From a paper:
Green fluorescent protein (GFP), which was discovered in the jellyfish Aequorea victoria, is a light-emitting protein consisting of 238 amino acids. GFP absorbs UV–blue light and emits green light. The structure consists of an 11-stranded β-barrel plugged by a chromophore [Fig. 1(a)]. The chromophore is 4-(p-hydroxybenzylidene)imidazolin-5-one, which is formed from three intrinsic residues (Ser65, Tyr66 and Gly67) in the polypeptide chain by a post-translational cyclization, dehydration and oxidation.
We used two different variants, S65T and E222Q, for the B form. The S65T substitution changes the conformation of Glu222 by relocating the hydroxyl group of the 65th residue. The donors and acceptors in the hydrogen bonds among Glu222, Ser205, a water and the chromophore switch with each other from those in the A form of wild-type GFP. Consequently, the chromophore becomes anionic, while Glu222 becomes neutral. The Cζ–Oη bond in the A form is 1.365 (10) Å, which is 0.05 Å longer compared with those in the B form: 1.314 (7) Å (S65T) or 1.315 (8) Å (E222Q). On the other hand, the structures of the B form (S65T and E222Q) differed from almost all of them. The difference in the orientation of Wat3 leads to a knock-on effect on the hydrogen-bonding network between Oη of the chromophore and Oγ of Ser205. On the other hand, the hydrogen-bonding patterns around Ser/Thr65 and Glu/Gln222 are significantly different [Figs. 5(c), 5(d) and 5(e)], while both S65T and E222Q are in the B form. The hydroxyl H atom of Thr65 in S65T is hydrogen-bonded to N2 of the imidazolinone ring of the chromophore, while the corresponding H atom of Ser65 in E222Q is hydrogen-bonded to Gln222. Although both the S65T and E222Q variants have spectroscopic features of the chromophore in the B form, the hydrogen bonds between Thr203 and the chromophore appear to differ.
Numbering used by the authors: 2 to 64, 68 to 231
Amino acid sequence: SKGEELFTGVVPILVELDGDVNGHKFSVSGEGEGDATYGKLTLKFICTTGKLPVPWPTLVTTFVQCFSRYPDHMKRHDFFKSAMPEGYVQERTISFKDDGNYKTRAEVKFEGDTLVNRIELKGIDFKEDGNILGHKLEYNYNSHNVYITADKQKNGIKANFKIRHNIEDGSVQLADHYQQNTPIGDGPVLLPDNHYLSTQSALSKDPNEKRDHMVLLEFVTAAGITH
């Protein structure tokens, strides 16, 4: 795609989110950069409204799959870069097993040379002292497979996957994800064969930062297609 050529180097990223979870309103701003050549993301997020009212890990998937590394032989399956620069809408329902749900709608597109992810998040049905509103999730992150399929009538894609959040008692909080993405612009986009993105993420803190924040280092590779 022409879109692909926009990602051969390091690209600066901005993330802006506004959220309302059970009437707790909040905002997050993030900055960093992506290097799709290496499937690599580096960002720092800051809650600008005070304390974040949900655990940071629960927002990772919401906070730019155009930075995944597509092997050369899988170039024809990279919807995400093909929609650039005009971008794509990304919508999800995230269902926290035996707790509430997030519904997210985001638009991912270039503003100048910067790749931007603008998100609105709404959370309902949460338990006041469940794992989310009760802040019972560990500050860490597991490795997943994101299963993608074409969604031809939308000129886009779907994804379906299961995120695992470790709980501080040693258990696990499942977050089922269902995702749909729709291109914004009028150039041709790539409608892929079924495949998956293999993810890994490391969460950390900046020792000099006293605002509520998250540092994220993430690597993602497309897989599941041999030729």
